[PDB]
Each structure stands twice: as structure tokens, then as C-alpha cells.
Amino acid sequence: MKVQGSVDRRRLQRRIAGLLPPPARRLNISRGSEFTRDVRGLVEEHAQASSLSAAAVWRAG
């Protein structure tokens, strides 16, 4: 408190949090439940990555 300081840890964290790579895309082939929970995501990500209408394509860009 006694001094404000010259930088904001909040801003530094939030500005880095936008430069970390996207995680990997796993696919469990040992449990049916996880297998489906990942294939659902696979189809959602294809849609989001190839549908012109949305801006999410341009974001994944």
C-alpha cells in the first residue's frame, strides 16, 4: 500500500494470457464416455473453424 508501484501485475498477467498457444486436442480411445466427449468437441471445432458466418473463424485465424 505504502507505494503504488509503477506496473500492474493484473495487466501483465492478462496481457500474457493472450499469447499462450492453444492446447493440444486429445482423444481418449480407452473409455467410451471420454471418446464421445472429445468427438463432440471435434465436430464443434470443425464448425467453428470453417463457418464463414461467425467471427470465431477469424479468431482461430
Binding site: R11, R14, R15, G18, L19, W58, R59, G61
Partner: protein
């Protein structure tokens, strides 16, 4: 249809044709260019006016 004729020697057989139609396919393209300054200052976060 067909007309039934008498003087014609053998009565004309009724007619049916098979017609096979094909569907053409046409593909369409456009190109839009976008700058990395936009694609970056978008991922960043605004804090000041």
C-alpha cells in the same frame, strides 16, 4: 399422348421415353485480406479510451 389412326396400317404403339437429366456444379470464390495489426490488437484487451 397419341392419335388413334385407321388408315395407318398398324396401330401406333403408345410411347414412353426415359430422360436422364444431369445437375451441373458451379463453385464460387472471393478473397479478403486482413492485417496482422488488426488480428493482434483484437486479441489484446483495451483498458484506456
Amino acid at each position: 399422348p397419341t392419335i388413334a389412326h385407321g388408315d395407318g396400317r398398324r396401330p401406333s404403339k403408345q410411347r414412353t421415353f426415359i430422360v436422364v437429366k444431369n445437375c451441373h456444379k458451379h463453385h464460387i470464390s472471393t478473397e479478403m485480406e486482413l492485417s496482422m495489426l488488426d488480428l493482434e490488437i483484437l486479441h489484446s484487451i483495451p483498458e484506456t479510451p
